[PDB]
Amino acid sequence: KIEEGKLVIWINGDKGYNGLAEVGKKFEKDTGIKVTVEHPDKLEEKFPQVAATGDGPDIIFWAHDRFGGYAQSGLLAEITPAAAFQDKLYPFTWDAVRYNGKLIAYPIAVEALSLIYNKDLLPNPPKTWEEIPALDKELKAKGKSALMFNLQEPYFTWPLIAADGGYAFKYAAGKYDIKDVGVDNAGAKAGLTFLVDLIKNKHMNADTDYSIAEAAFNKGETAMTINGPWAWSNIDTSAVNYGVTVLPTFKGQPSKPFVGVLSAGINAASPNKELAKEFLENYLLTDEGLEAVNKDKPLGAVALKSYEEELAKDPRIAATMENAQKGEIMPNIPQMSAFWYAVRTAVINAASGRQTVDAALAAAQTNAAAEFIDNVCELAARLLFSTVEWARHAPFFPELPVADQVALLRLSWSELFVLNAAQAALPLHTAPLLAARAVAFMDQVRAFQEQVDKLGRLQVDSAEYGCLKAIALFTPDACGLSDPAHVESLQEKAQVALTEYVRAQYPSQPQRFGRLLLRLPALRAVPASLISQLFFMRLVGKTPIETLIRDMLLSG
Amino acid sequence: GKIEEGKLVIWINGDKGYNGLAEVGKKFEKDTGIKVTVEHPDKLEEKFPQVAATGDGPDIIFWAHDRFGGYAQSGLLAEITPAAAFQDKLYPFTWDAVRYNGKLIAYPIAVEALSLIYNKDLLPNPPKTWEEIPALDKELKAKGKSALMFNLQEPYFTWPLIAADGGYAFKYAAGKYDIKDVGVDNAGAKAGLTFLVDLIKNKHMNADTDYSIAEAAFNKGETAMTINGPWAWSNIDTSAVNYGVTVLPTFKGQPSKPFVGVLSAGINAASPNKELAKEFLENYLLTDEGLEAVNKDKPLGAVALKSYEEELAKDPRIAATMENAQKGEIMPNIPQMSAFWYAVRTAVINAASGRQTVDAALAAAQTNAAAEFIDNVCELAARLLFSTVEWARHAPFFPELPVADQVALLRLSWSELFVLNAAQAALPLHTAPLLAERAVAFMDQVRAFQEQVDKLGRLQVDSAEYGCLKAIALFTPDACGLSDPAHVESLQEKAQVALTEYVRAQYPSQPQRFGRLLLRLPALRAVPASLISQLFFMRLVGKTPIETLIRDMLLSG
Amino acid sequence: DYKFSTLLMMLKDMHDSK
Amino acid sequence: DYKFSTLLMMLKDMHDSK
Ligand SMILES: OC[C@H]1O[C@H](O[C@H]2[C@H](O)[C@@H](O)[C@@H](O)O[C@@H]2CO)[C@H](O)[C@@H](O)[C@@H]1O
Ligand SMILES: OC[C@H]1O[C@H](O[C@H]2[C@H](O)[C@@H](O)[C@@H](O)O[C@@H]2CO)[C@H](O)[C@@H](O)[C@@H]1O
C-alpha cells in the first residue's frame, strides 16, 4: 500500500533526480508534505510489477512510450488539468500523453539523440555513417577511436536501423497499425548490417554500454558518441570541449531517432492524487521548477512554452530539435514494450555474432507483431473447426460409414480449409515467415496466395464455394474407402449441382463450370504441412492436423 | 505400427468360412484364454504385403499358396517348423506347395479347384464341351434362362479355358519354373480367350458379370451353369437349386486346365505370437474337428489332413474337384505370379469388353508377365518423356508462345502430361520400388500413381480426350512467371470448350463426362515430378532435375 | 479472445494424454 | 535398343559440360 500525506517519485537514474528533489524540498517547505525522489534500476519494468498490486510511487517519470501500456493495465490515474494550465504546454506534447482520448501523464520535456563529438579531436564531424570506418582507422593510429555509444539499448541503435526504411508500427489513417511492423524490411536490414560490420571490422566493440561509452568520450579516448541532453552535464564537468550536431546520414538519408517525451504519471493506487497534481502543476511545471532539474541534468526542449523560449537559443537544443524533426515521436501504444524487447534481442544477438542480421530481424518481426497479436492463427483455428463441422453436415456425408468419413477428411481437409480461407479473406499477404527447403517453402506460400487471388478474380460466390467444398470432399482419390463407387456418385451430385447453378445464375458465362473445376488441382497442391507451419505450429507443434481432425469428427 | 501380443488376429478371404474358423478360435480361447479375432478385409492379398512391410497386419494370413513365395521373398513370413510327426499328418504334395527355397513358409489347409456347377432340373446332362454352350444357351434363352454365368472379372475363372489349348503362364523346366518362358500369348491362349469373347459378342454371356451376379443368378435358378470352387457349395445348399458338380467342359477336345490353389496359413514375420499361432494352427485348426468346423461353414475342398481327407474324398463333389485339379495345374508359388495374375486380369477385362482385340491384349500381358528387368519400363518411360515434350511443342497455340512462357508451362505441367502419357501407353506400373523412414510415404505416392492410372482406364478415356486433357494441363495459369496469364487462360478455355463439345457429341448418354474428366486433374498434380525421376530416370540423370533438361530441349531447337 | 486457439490446444493435450 | 535411355543420358552429359 501507498502512504498518504507524502509523495514518492520514481525517475530514471540518468535524469536529474537531485534537481527534482530540490523542487520536492521547496514543496515540503511551502506545504509540509514530504517528497522522496528515488531512481530504482529497471523501473520501467519495476513500476508495472509493483503498481499491479496497488504499490509503488505516487508519481512515475518516463518517456511517453511506456505509458499507454501502463494506462491499459489500469495503473495510471487520468489527469485533469484546467484548460488554462494545458495552454502553458505545447499541444504536441499533450498528444504524446493522450491515450484513448484520456490524458494519462504530465509532459515534461522532449528528448532526442544527437551526435556528440570532441571538437579538439574532430573539428569537422562526419556527415555520413559511411565515413566512420576510414575516420576510425585514421584515429586508431593516434591511440583513439572514432565512435563509441551504447550498443545494449536499442534506443541508441534505432536511428541507424530506421534511416533506410526501418520502422516499428506504421501510422495509418490516424493510428498505429500493430499488423504492419517494419523491423525486418530491407532498410532495417541495411542499417543493422552496417552496425554489425562496424563490429566485425573492430571499429566498435559489441560489449559497449552506457558507462563505457560515456567514460570513453569524457576521458577523450573517443572522438564521437551518441546520447541525449541528460549526458551534457558530465561532459561539461569533464575536460572535453564538445559539440552537439546532426546525426550522420546512412545511404544518403538522415538517421531517424525515436523521440521521447519525458512524462510524469500519477499512480492509480496513490491516495495523494491532488498533492501530486499540485506538485506537478504548480512546482515542477514552472520556469523555476524545470530550471532546478535542468541544472542537474538537461531535459531537452521542455514542454513548458515560457521556459522553452529561453532554452531555445542554445545551439545544443537546436541540434536536439533538428534530430527530432528527422525522426518520429514514439507511439505510446501498449505494444511498444513488445517492440522494444524484440529489437533489444535482435541487436544484441546480431552484434555478438550469435545470429545473422536476417535471422535476428526475422525473430524481432515475429515478436513485435505476435501473429497480429496471434489473431490470424486464431482466425485460422476457427476456420479449422468450421471446416470439420461443414463436412459433417454436408449432404450425404453423415450417412457414410465412419471409416469413409475419416478417409475423406484425411485427404481433403486442407482443400476445404483453403476454400474457407479464401472465402474468409484470411490475411495471407502478411507472409508470417515463421521458420522452425527455403525458396521451396516460399514458393508454396506464393502459390497459396496466388490461388486465393484466382478465386477472387473468378468472383466465386457463396453458393459456388458450397459446391466446390462438396466436390473436393467426396473425392474417390481418398485411400481405403469402402464403396468408392458410392463416393463417385456423391461427387457427381455435387458436380451436377454446380452445373445447374452456374447455367441458371451466369448464363452469359457458358464456361464457368469447367473454369471453376480447373481451380481444384491447385487446391490439392497446397500441402497440409504448409497450413500447419503457417497457422498451427505454435498450438499443436509436431502433431498432424489429420489426426486431430479425426478426433473432432469422431469425438461426438 | 505394431501387432498386439497375447491374442491372435487372423485374415481370411470373405468367400471362405470365417465363421467356422471363428468357432475354432472360440475353442482355442476356451482352452487357453487367448482371444482369436478373425477378419475378412477386402483385397487382403494386396493389403497384407502393404501393412506387413511396416511390421503391421494380422498374426496369421490365409490365402492360396501362390502369393506366399512373394511374401517370403519380401521377408514377410515366419518360417514354420512343425515336427516330423505333425508333417506326417498332411499329404506331401500339400507341403510342396508351401515350400519356397527349401523353407516351409505356411501351413497347407486344403486343395481348391474350379469345377462346372450345374442345375440338375434345368440341365440333367451338362455339356462335355465348351462348343455345345451357345446352342444350349439359345435353347434355354427361349425359356427365360441362360446357360452359363461365371465371374469374368477375375482371371482365375477364365484361365481354365485359356490354358486348355496351350496357354501356360510359366514353363516348368529342369525342376523349376522358368521366368523367361511365358505362355500367355501363344496360339492356344489366343484360341481360348477368343472363344470366351465370342460368347460375349453373341450375347451368350455378359462382360460385366462378376462373382455376385453369377452366384445370385445360379442360386436363384436364372442360369443353368456356373464355374466356382468348393466354398460356393454352401450357398447353393441353402438355396432352392438341386445341383451337381462335374468336370469342366473341354475346349477343342482338350480338358480345361484350372489353376489349382492350396489354401495356406502363414505366420506374420513381425508377430509376437508365433508360438500361439503355431499352437492354434497345428493343434486346433489342422484337426478333424477344426477342419470340420470350417468345412460346415464353407467347404474347403480336398483338405491336406489325411485322416479327414479320406472321408471327404468319397464325396462326388470332392471327386469332381480333384478330377479338375488333376487336369489342371498346381500354381507356382514364385514371386512373379502376382505380375502374371495382374497382366492376365487386365488382358481379359479389356478383351471381354471389346476395347482391345484378343491378340493385342495378350501381347501386352506377355511382356508385362515376362519382365524380371526394369530396363524396358525405364526405356518406355524415357520415350514417353521425349514424346511428352514433343507433344507440347506442337500443341495448338503453344509454338506461338514466348519461350519463357513455354518453359514455365512445361516446368509445372510436364509430370502431369507424363502421367497421362503413361496411362495412355499402359506403362507397367507394378514392380519393386527399387528399395529409409518415410519410405512408406514414397510407397504411398507409388500407389496413388497406380490408382490414378486405373481410374483413367475405368473412365475409358479415349485418345481424343487424352489430347484435350493434356492441353488443359499444359495451359495452366497456375504456372509461375507467365508474361500474359490471361492469354494462357483463354488457351485453356479453348481446350476446355473442345473437350465439352467432344463428349457432348461422342457420349451424349453421359451428360457428366466432361466434369468427371476434369475431376481427374487434381490427382495429376499430386503425382510429384520427383517420383517420376526416382522411378525411371535416376539411373540416367542422377540428381539433375528433368525440368532443366526440358528447358534445354525447348531452347535447343 | 483466442477461443479456437485454446480449443485446438485442448485437442492437442487430449491426444498427448493419449 | 535402349535408344531413349541413351538419348536421356546425352541430354544429361550435354547439360553437365554446360
Ligand atoms: O532502448 C530502448 C528504450 O528506449 C527508450 O528509453 C530511453 C529513454 O527514452 C531515454 O530517456 C533514456 O533513458 O534512454 C533510454 C534508453 O536506454 C524507451 O523509453 C524505452 O521504453 C525503451 O526500452
Ligand atoms: O484371379 C486371380 C487370383 O487367382 C487366385 O485367387 C483365387 C483364390 O485362389 C481362390 O481361393 C478364390 O478366392 O478365388 C480367387 C480368385 O477370385 C490366386 O490365388 C490369386 O493370387 C490371384 O490374384
Residue numbers in the entry:
A (entry chain A): 2 to 437, 449 to 568
B (entry chain B): 1 to 435, 447 to 568
C (entry chain C), D (entry chain D): 1 to 18
Wording from the paper:
The orphan nuclear receptor NR2F6 (Nuclear Receptor subfamily 2 group F member 6) is an emerging therapeutic target for cancer immunotherapy. Although NR2F6 has been demonstrated to exert both activating − and repressing ,− effects on gene transcription, the cofactor proteins mediating NR2F6 transcriptional activity remain to be elucidated. It has been proposed that the mechanism behind NR2F6 transcriptional repression is the direct recruitment of corepressor proteins to DNA-bound NR2F6 homo- or heterodimers (e.g., with RXRs), , while transcriptional activation could occur through direct recruitment of coactivator proteins to DNA-bound NR2F6 or through indirect recruitment via the interaction with other DNA-bound transcription factors. , Since the NR2F6 LBD itself confers transcriptional repressive activity, the direct recruitment of NR coregulators to the NR2F6 LBD was investigated.
To improve protein stability, the NR2F6 LBD was truncated to residues 199–393 and fused to a mutant MBP containing surface entropy reduction (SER) mutations . Subsequent additive screening optimized the initial hit condition, yielding diffraction-grade crystals that enabled elucidation of the NR2F6 LBD/NSD1 peptide cocrystal structure at 2.6 Å in the P61 space group (crystal data collection and refinement statistics are listed in Table S2). The asymmetric unit contains two copies of the MBP-NR2F6 fusion protein (termed monomer A and B) and two copies of the NSD1 peptide. In both monomers of NR2F6, H10 breaks at P364, with the lower half of this helix collapsing into the orthosteric ligand binding pocket. The collapsed orthosteric ligand binding pocket allows H12 to fold over the canonical coregulator binding site, binding the interface formed by H3, H4, H5 and H10 with the hydrophobic sequence IETLIRDML (underlined residues face the interaction surface). The α-helical NSD1 peptide binds the interface formed by H3, H10 and H12, with L911 and L914 of NSD1 buried into the hydrophobic surface pocket created by residues A207, L210 and F211 on H3, F373, L376 and V377 on H10 and T380, I382, L385 and M389 on H12.
